[PDB]
From a paper:
Among bisindoles, reductasporine is distinct due to its dimethylpyrrolinium structure. Its previously reported biosynthetic gene cluster encodes two unique tailoring enzymes, the imine reductase RedE and the dimethyltransferase [name], which were shown to produce reductasporine from a common bisindole intermediate in recombinant E. coli. [name] is a homodimeric protein with monomers consisting of a largely α-helical N-terminal domain (α1-10, β1-3) and a Rossmann-like fold C-terminal domain (α12–16, β4-10) bridged by a long interdomain α-helix (α11).
Between the [name]-SAH and [name]-SAM binary complexes, there are distinct open and closed conformations, respectively. The homodimers of both unliganded-[name] and [name]-SAH structures superpose well on each other (rmsdCα = 0.175 Å, 553 Cα) and comparatively poorly upon the [name]-SAM homodimer (rmsdCα = 1.244 Å, 593 Cα) due to a substantial displacement of the C-terminal Rossmann-like SAM-binding domain. The cofactor binding pocket is outlined by the C-terminal ends of β4-8 and clear electron density shows the cofactor is held in an extended conformation similar to related small molecule methyltransferases. The main chains of C185, A186, and G188 form the foundation of the cavity between the ribosyl and methionine moieties, while D182 hydrogen bonds to two conserved water positions creating the basis for a network of hydrogen bonds bridging the α-amine to I183, Y280, and G249 via its amide nitrogen. The carbonyl groups of G184 and G249 receive hydrogen bonds from the α-amine, while H250 and Y280 donate hydrogen bonds to the cofactor carboxylate group. The adenine ring is clamped between F235 and L208 and capped with a hydrogen bond to D234.
Residue numbers in the entry:
A (entry chain A): 12 to 134, 147 to 344
B (entry chain B): 12 to 131, 157 to 344
The structure:
């Protein structure tokens, strides 16, 4: 019945917390070498004997742990993605959800009532892990972005608000004819340059320190805005599109990607939940639809635009000057 | 990919809070009389304009509201079961989750580390009550006592369903007012009585059948076995004890509701726990009951029955 599906979603915070706590505990990392019996896993996590078995078996019943003859083991997904120290480790996402996001969303009612953010504005190694996970998700968007656009038509690309440069680096690795410029605040420069040095791209990639609310954007054939316009109130986003249009040549493109809401605002749960995340986290940020963005790009003067799926929950709007 | 499913479970607290806040705001009760445009719904709920449309549309995307021409309406399920004031209302589970359980489960880590609790319905009991009345041949018995009866919903339904029965509700004295109200509502008169007491301090009422609905799981195992001993002492030869719980499956690898309930018991009680049918049958045999059986009762709730 539909009411059963609804109650299951409404009480989803419990199953959520089980996985979140397991990640915060590093439970899956303790099983990376091989299976462990219940008492050994409990002792390594320093859990009380009262509920350790229940906790482990809940993970088994949720499909994220295996158990055979009293010994628990990783599933293929947790061995691959929830083992700390591996290059593919995404557990930092869950670690940050457990440490911060879970309680932040506990203030949804007050954010909805006041319209005001409910995080630190209202009031160590987990940040590295979370940043590793962000770089991971960024890489997925970057792999798709490299294949979704005919990059042979362009010679230069500028990533606006590039952070550590993951998308830009992967783009230039997949398309060796491209030259790239990452644009971000000066404080981002060392993280970006460490990835630049690791990539071996050399002079093909540069960083420009800047504030995009106070100076022009680098000229390039393609400008990329990944998770940029959504952080700000709309007049500030339109300012950025004007600067993008001024930075581009004729036939150059702007690429905007976000966890966009579907145009009819009735299908895309992750995009709509992200709009609520922007409520809780920023003064004026917001998630939007592709159709919203196409209207802004038309106001800014772009000749044409289209919405296109990217990967995971991400999609993009591409416009031509 | 199974990893995409894992990540959807892990972040399920977001969609959960959307629904919980909706239920605590009575949003579906506001749409009970008819559809409303977003602004009118925003005004009636006292929500800020920044995010009201996002919130309403998330509920549409989750499939619990419908929207057309800018007007929102209940779905059939939310009109049938999430509208306050109706006897079928199931939203009390959601309201208490939003007020208490969401943040309580935020302390799951401390519970697991310390083993200590971290905390310091009539409709949902009615589904079990109806199933209990139909799953047991109550014509074989004359009297029934419900041990820890709360407001008496299950016992009242049994007596309404089987008019030959005489019933006794047993609970702490503080529960008696709420029992008396439901007893007065039922018109059952002399066929139903409340007995105040503490089942760890005094014997249980004698009856042909004793019912333990969501009792044993609240207590450490020695105390649960003590209750089964007292049930054996209170029953006649051929009498039955009826236990119902959201039992974990015997292999302890599939029943997510039962396993989550055991963690709920961790967070809420000093020594309670969820258990399996096989567990309960062993306890019943140790207590001297002749025979026992486990059957599904109603959705996630199962029943263990034993005969003296
Ligand atoms: N005023 C400003 N000028 C330049 N960059 C800014 C800025 N304000 C914020 N940023 C940058 O914008 C980025 C937003 S996070 C987005 C990072 C990346 N595009 C991705 O998709 O993962 C941050 O790296 C932040 O440093
Ligand atoms: N020591 C005690 N003596 C008698 N009743 C007790 C008790 N300790 C707890 N209880 C009762 O046990 C009940 C547990 S809640 C379960 C209520 C009911 N059987 C149902 O399924 O809905 C509460 O009503 C509480 O009042
Ligand atoms: Cl150029």
């Amino acid at each position: 019945p539909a009411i059963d599906r609804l109650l299951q979603i409404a009480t989803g915070f419990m199953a959520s917390k089980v996985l979140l706590v397991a990640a915060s505990l590093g439970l899956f990392t303790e099983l990376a070498a091989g299976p462990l019996r219940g008492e050994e896993l409990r002792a390594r996590l320093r859990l009380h004997p009262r509920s350790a078995r229940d906790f482990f078996d809940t993970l088994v019943a949720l499909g994220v742990l295996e158990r055979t003859n009293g010994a628990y083991a990783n599933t293929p997904a947790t061995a691959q993605y929830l083992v700390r120290g591996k290059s593919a480790y995404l557990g930092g996402l869950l670690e940050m959800s457990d440490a911060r996001m879970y309680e932040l969303w506990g203030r949804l009612d007050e954010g909805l009532r006041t319209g005001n953010p409910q995080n630190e504005i209202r009031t160590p190694d987990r940040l590295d892990a979370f940043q590793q996970a962000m770089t991971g998700l960024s890489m997925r968007s970057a792999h798709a972005l490299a294949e979704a656009i005919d990059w042979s038509a362009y010679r230069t690309v500028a990533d606006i608000g590039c952070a550590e440069g993951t998308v830009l680096i992967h783009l230039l690795e997949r398309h060796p004819h491209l030259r790239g410029t990452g644009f971000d605040l000066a404080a981002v420069r060392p993280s970006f340059q460490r990835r630049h040095e690791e990539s071996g791209l050399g002079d093909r990639l540069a960083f420009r320190a800047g504030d995009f609310f106070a100076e022009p954007l680098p000229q390039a054939d393609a400008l990329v805005f990944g998770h940029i316009l959504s952080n700000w109130a709309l007049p500030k986003a339109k300012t950025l599109l004007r600067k993008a249009h001024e930075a581009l040549p004729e036939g150059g493109i702007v690429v905007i990607y976000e966890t966009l809401i579907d145009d009819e605002r009735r299908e895309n749960v992750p995009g709509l939940l992200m709009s609520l995340t922007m409520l809780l986290e920023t003064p004026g940020g917001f998630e939007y639809t592709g159709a919203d963005c196409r209207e802004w790009l038309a106001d800014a003067g772009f000749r044409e635009s289209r919405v296109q799926y990217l990967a995971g929950p991400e999609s993009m709007v591409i416009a031509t000057k």
